Each structure stands twice: as structure tokens, then as C-alpha cells.
Design a protein around this motif. Structure first.
Motif: not given
Ligand code: CL
Length: 151
Positions: A57-60, A62-69
């Protein structure tokens, strides 16, 4: 004010770190005939997933993607299990797999705590999440150490 690059990376990394707890628990639910180990694996899956939902939810927001692996070497430093170690839970004799599960999950949780402590000094929702992670990880470590001693 927007989340800092350090906060964004922390949440991205912790989301992947938590996800691995699910990979470690799955073979216990598949293979263990110890109610003790099974109960514990279920409980850890549920607690880790609750925190993953918060991180997603936080990443959503903030409009931030999941990390690179995360890379294998850096995953290892984070206390994550290697590819081989996770596979051992499916291939080792069950009694050895149960002990390995506890050892791997303890090291995993120790790495989570070590990643999280520096975030205690941060945006309020990140501080709150960090405190929850540390408390929950430390509770589960103590239980797992007790179980490992009783096996
Ligand atoms: Cl979930």
C-alpha cells in the motif's frame, strides 16, 4: 513531503525480504508432520503477509514500483536464504528440513531487524512500520529459538 530515496528502497527491499518467508514456510506445510512446526510456519506466513500488504500500500501511495530484484550476494547479506538453502527444505530428510527451516528463518529475521533499526531515526508511517517489523521479528525469533531447542 514525498518519501526519501532511502525510505523507498527500505520498503522495496523489505517487501522482497518478507516474501521469502513465504517460500520458506511452504515446504513445512507440505512436508512436516509436527503440529508444532506447522503451527509456527502458518503464524509466520500470516504475520509476514500482513506487513507485506502494508508495504504494498505504501509503494502504491508513493507511486513507486517494486524494487529491482535483490542480487544473490546482497540477499545473503540481508540474511535471506540462498536458492540452494530454500531447495533443501524440500529435499532434505524431514527432520533435518525442520531444523533448517528454523535456522534459516531465524537468520532471515535477524537480517530484517538489522535492516530496520536504522529506519527508527523518518516519515511517521515508515517509523511505525519499522517499529512493527522489529517487534514482530524479535517475537518470532524468540519462539523459533525455543522450538529449535525443543526439537
Ligand atoms: Cl496477503
Amino acid at each position: 513531503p514525498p518519501a526519501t530515496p532511502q525510505e523507498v528502497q527500505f520498503v522495496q527491499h523489505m517487501l522482497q525480504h518478507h516474501a521469502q518467508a513465504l517460500d520458506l514456510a511452504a515446504p513445512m506445510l507440505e512436508r512436516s508432520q509436527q503440529r508444532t512446526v506447522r503451527s509456527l510456519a502458518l503464524d509466520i506466513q500470516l504475520s509476514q503477509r500482513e506487513q507485506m500488504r502494508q508495504m504494498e500500500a505504501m509503494l502504491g501511495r508513493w507511486g513507486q514500483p517494486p524494487g529491482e530484484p535483490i542480487s544473490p550476494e546482497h540477499a545473503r547479506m540481508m540474511g535471506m536464504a540462498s536458492e540452494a538453502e530454500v531447495a533443501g527444505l524440500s529435499t532434505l530428510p524431514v527432520e533435518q528440513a525442520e531444523r533448517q527451516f528454523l535456522r534459516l528463518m531465524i537468520r532471515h529475521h535477524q537480517g530484517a531487524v538489522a535492516m530496520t533499526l536504522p529506519m527508527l531515526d523518518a516519515r511517521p508511517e515508515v517509523e511505525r512500520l519499522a517499529r512493527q517489523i522489529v517487534v514482530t521479528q524479535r517475537g518470532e525469533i524468540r519462539t523459533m529459538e525455543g522450538v529449535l531447542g525443543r526439537l
